[PDB]
Design a binder for this molecule. Structure first.
Ligand code: AMP
Ligand code: AMP
Ligand code: TRP
Ligand code: TRP
Lengths: 301, 297
């Protein structure tokens, strides 16, 4: 089976990145890494960090990520990551690092950690956007550079969101992508948003439902299963008011089961057990790579 | 006891640092790390590397380093090293790094790794020279910045070592890295090489001749005042012949033990026990670090 690696630091994420994973995970060997070591490249409150790792894990599970199916782990719990990362920072060039479009040295040297994340698992696909295209080009060069010197250890990874989905825009600025990092909470809808916020958020000159309206349609159709033409027919003479009233219900219906599970997980001692399994599985596959890598460089014995 | 940490990548060395430790290990908690991870910041042949790691260990044991006493281990075998290094590579500044007095990024980022090497063990002293003084001030700075943000978790380390020149250039310092193999005497140099190297205008033994006295004076236990006396009214030929014998006598039992360690499988066992011990101390420091930063659970 092919290998997929996703490193994770809104309904736009569910719909673009996170949704097709609940089933893709059945046809692929999937890894969902919570990159907490990448997160400290910037200022964190230890309490929020620790607590943000938890919710994320519980959310991926609440969404349908199956731990029997996929490997969901926390990056720092697999030391092979920081190990392979060091070896790769020894083969990478500063020039390469500074040329990175995107001060603590972590802001500069994190690219080799992201490459280690990927290369450790002999991954084939990396479900990332164009914003990470440069990071992938680089981990692909690093793999090639190492495979040529020491002989082939790595699969050269490819940048793909297999079965990718509609791009979700902001509710305040439909020319802007939906981002949880938005200063206006009204711009996005969070997977944990309560029925009432969703409604209010959805509620806030031409008047025709035909493909901001184009964003509400993309949201409506992916979430309801209907085609944009179905809905264009459905609302042929209808106003934005009832369309929105309808759309707010399909969003609440989607997030309800999700939110109900997120809470069971957050309360379950099974959450900690699922992450323990995932790091064991990962440490195993990763630990093996690290020693094949050292074997090749002449490290230790 | 106070903790001493030494990271290792001639007789100049032995006289300088390594020899005293044989006594010190009993009074201090000493760690002798073979920095194989630092070694890869520059081009290595995988075979020679793997090989040099082995002999360095055998040489240290052969010199008198007591494993029941100190901790001799290979850096790569303690993962906590690269983990702490990353955490410290996020608090260090690039500017800090770039002013580093000393291309592959390993050549710019290894300082945070060298500070972790030290900080992981709550080391009090680091027995290094002046060339590392910029390196130590930086690790004292990183520890400081960390404690003040998170709380008191590292002992601020001191750089103190509780000078032999080249034999071909007495204004230059002895260094294996000399293009000229006669500039130095290796610990493994045979008796013939030792003699030759030592044989190679005032003609008076008073303090390149001041260097020989210093080599002699300390491998012998005698003193310079007492050696000047001894060698009143003789010249360099005898002085040089007696001195080649104190050097052969010194290195001979070291070479015997070294060879025994090199084919003994107690070697791999001393190293296993060594990494095990390090992993224990370091691992705990690491989870204490992630605790302060909020990493994992
Ligand atoms: N508003 C959005 N619309 C579509 N895809 C998104 C949106 N927000 C995040 N993603 C995707 O979800 C994943 C999370 O990465 P990030 O871009 O940081 O959000 C990536 O693959 C993004 O491409
Ligand atoms: N030729 C030498 N003369 C005196 N001390 C030396 C000599 N070589 C090494 N040392 C000491 O032993 C160590 C090895 O030097 P280095 O490992 O390059 O920093 C240092 O701590 C020096 O202070
Ligand atoms: N760097 C990515 C997250 C990430 C870390 N490691 C990865 C490995 C593969 C894909 C993505 C990642 C981001 O900014 O969100
Ligand atoms: N960087 C040192 C060796 C070293 C690595 N880590 C260390 C920690 C403490 C003291 C020295 C070291 C050298 O150039 O030789």
């Amino acid at each position: 089976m092919k290998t997929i690696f996703s490193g994770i630091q809104t309904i736009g994420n569910y719909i673009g990145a996170l949704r097709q994973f609940v089933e893709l995970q059945h046809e692929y060997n999937c890894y969902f890494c919570i990159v907490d070591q990448h997160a400290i490249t910037v200022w964190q409150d230890p309490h929020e960090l620790r607590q943000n790792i938890r919710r994320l894990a519980a959310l991926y599970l609440a969404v349908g990520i199956d731990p029997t199916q996929a490997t969901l782990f926390i990056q720092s719990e697999v030391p092979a990551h920081a190990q392979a990362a060091w070896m790769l920072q020894c083969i990478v060039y500063i020039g390469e690092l500074e040329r990175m479009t995107q001060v603590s040295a972590g802001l500069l040297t994190y690219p080799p950690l992201m490459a280690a994340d990927i290369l450790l698992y002999n991954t084939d696909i990396v479900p990332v956007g164009e914003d990470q295209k440069q990071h992938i080009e680089l981990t692909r060069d690093l793999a090639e550079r190492f495979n040529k010197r020491y002989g082939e250890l790595f699969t050269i990874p490819e940048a793909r969101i297999p079965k990718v989905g509609a791009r979700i825009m902001s509710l305040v600025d439909p020319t802007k992508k939906m981002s949880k990092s938005d200063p206006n909470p009204k711009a996005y809808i969070t997977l944990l948003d309560d029925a009432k916020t969703i409604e209010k958020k959805i509620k806030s000159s031409e008047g025709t439902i035909r493909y901001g309206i184009s964003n509400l349609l993309n949201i409506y159709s992916t979430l309801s299963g209907q085609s944009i033409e179905e809905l264009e027919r459905q609302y042929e003479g209808k106003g934005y008011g009832v369309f929105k009233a309808d759309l707010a219900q399909v969003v609440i219906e989607t997030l309800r089961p999700i939110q109900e599970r997120y809470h069971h997980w957050m309360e379950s001692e099974e959450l900690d057990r699922v992450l323990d399994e995932g790091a064991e599985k990962a440490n195993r596959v990763a630990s093996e790579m690290v020693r094949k890598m050292e074997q090749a460089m002449g490290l230790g014995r």
